């Protein structure tokens, strides 16, 4: 039966039948957004949903027999597996993010269609060349985030009161979002010199970030 089904899985129909379901279930998830629509056709799309989830596991089952070890060494397939798994955890118990993480299946449209895969891949492959920078920066953030927790945390605990909080605040300064009126000016009402901490921090982080962008245009 193997070659029989290996001809079902590889079929242009089967793959395009999947793509057809993704665009359908996607359309169906934007409808589940409407409180109004749920009062009309709630039960329609709840069944239609459970339906698709089976179809996608049947596929991922069929997909596994045909590929065996090759399937659990394919990024795109591994993905597809995990995104269906999440979609399998019972409509109850534990966390309810799992009910929300179910919308992650529409990322299969990125998997089941090339060019998307191409472009996603094109994007990802730049990451390794950045890891050298990304490491530098994380050490940098970690260092300043400690100083800040221990320099501003007592008077300004919302923003720097915890190592995590300082990370968040520092991230926020880095995106330059409301950084002066929102943070440094307040801080300076108490700590006149806080500008000595954040201006250098901004230069560095802004400089480094600019280099990272030119690095991705040297290749």
Q: What are the CB-based long-range contacts (under 8 Å, 24+) for 157-166?
A: 159/183
* Cβ neighbours, 10 Å, residue 169: 23
Whose Cβ is closer to its own copies: residue 14's or residue 141's?
A: 141
User: Could you give the angle at the alpha carbon of 161 between the alpha carbons of 155 and 163, nearest 5°?
Assistant: 150
Which tokens go with 72?
Answer: 């659990």
Q: Which of 38, 46, 147, 155 binds its own copies (CB under 8 A)?
A: 147
Residue 13 binds its own copies (CB under 8 A):
no
Q: CA 29, CA 49: separation in Å to the nearest integer?
A: 9
Residue 211 binds its own copies (CB under 8 A):
yes
> Considering only 5-13, 52-60, 81-89, 172-180, which stretch makes contact with its own copies by CB under 8 A?
172-180
* Cβ at position 151, least distance to its own copies in Å: 6
Please name the residue ranges forming H helices in 86-162. Answer: 98-101, 108-111, 116-124, 127-152, 157-160
Residue 120 binds its own copies (CB under 8 A):
yes
Residue 58 binds its own copies (CB under 8 A):
no
Q: Which of 109, 129, 141, 155 binds its own copies (CB under 8 A)?
A: 109
Closest residue to Ca ion, based on beta-carbon distance: 178
């Amino acid at each position: 039966m193997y070659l029989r089904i290996t001809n079902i899985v590889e079929s242009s129909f089967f793959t395009k039948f999947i793509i057809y379901l993704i665009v359908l279930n996607g359309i169906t998830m934007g409808l589940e957004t409407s409180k109004t629509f749920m009062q009309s056709f709630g039960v329609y799309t709840t069944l239609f949903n459970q339906i698709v989830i089976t179809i996608f596991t049947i596929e991922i089952i069929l997909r596994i027999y045909v590929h065996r070890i090759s399937f659990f060494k394919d990024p795109w397939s591994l993905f597809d597996f995990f995104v269906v798994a999440i979609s399998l955890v019972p409509t109850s118990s534990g966390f309810e993010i799992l009910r929300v993480l179910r919308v992650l299946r529409l990322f299969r449209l990125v998997t089941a269609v090339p060019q998307m895969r191409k472009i996603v891949s094109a994007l990802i492959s730049v990451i390794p060349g950045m890891l050298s920078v990304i490491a530098l920066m994380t050490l940098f953030f970690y260092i300043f985030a400690i100083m800040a927790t221990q320099l501003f945390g007592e008077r300004f605990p919302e923003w720097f009161g915890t190592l995590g909080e300082s990370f968040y605040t520092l991230f926020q300064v880095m995106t330059l979002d409301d950084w002066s009126n929102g943070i440094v000016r307040p801080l300076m009402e108490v700590y006149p010199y806080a500008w000595v901490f954040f201006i250098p921090f901004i230069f560095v982080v802004t400089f480094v970030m600019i280099n990272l962008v030119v690095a991705i245009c040297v290749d």
